[PDB]
Ligand binder design. Structure first.
Ligand code: HEM
Ligand SMILES: [C-]#N
Length: 128
């Protein structure tokens, strides 16, 4: 936990500094509200079990930012490949993530840091 890691002189992770698991859960919920209300994106998730996705994304986002959480989903390249996702789509999704972070009160500097961890994933997520 954060306390245990601090007693062992480990640096504070992005996960811990934005409020850990509960912060990620709040942000992911908001994020998908934003994504599904965007006409340019909603169709990608037609028929997708959103309850299930949100759970995987909470795990994935937590793990990526330094949480202890198990990621239980499939690899990014295999999940997204062939879905006709372009950098324009990727960027919109990253935009909604930034907007959810802002709405949750995450300092802009830390959102930029989070996008620096996420942006590289575009190589696996896009086909365009
Ligand atoms: C920004 C970086 C992204 C991350 C970290 C991410 C993460 C994830 C995760 C964890 C899953 C769940 C995989 C599983 O079920 O095992 C997933 C699935 C999915 N993602 Fe993404 N994603 C990203 C970008 C995008 C974009 C840009 C789109 C479309 C514009 C997209 C559309 C989808 C779809 C359609 C699924 C599968 C839902 C289903 O199985 O029906 N993702 N993604
Ligand atoms: C992908 N959400």
């Amino acid at each position: 936990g954060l306390l245990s890691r601090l007693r062992k002189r480990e640096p504070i992770s992005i996960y811990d500094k934005i409020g850990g698991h509960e912060a990620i859960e709040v942000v992911v919920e908001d994020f998908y509200v934003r994504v599904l209300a965007d006409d340019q994106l909603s169709a990608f998730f037609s028929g997708t079990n959103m309850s299930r996705l949100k759970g995987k994304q909470v795990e994935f986002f937590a793990a990526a930012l330094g949480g202890p959480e198990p990621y239980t989903g499939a690899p990014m390249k295999q999940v997204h490949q062939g879905r006709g996702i372009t950098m324009h789509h990727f960027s919109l999704v990253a935009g909604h993530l930034a907007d959810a972070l802002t709405a949750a009160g995450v300092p802009s500097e830390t959102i930029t840091e989070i996008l620096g961890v996420i942006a590289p994933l575009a190589v696996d997520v896009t086909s365009g």
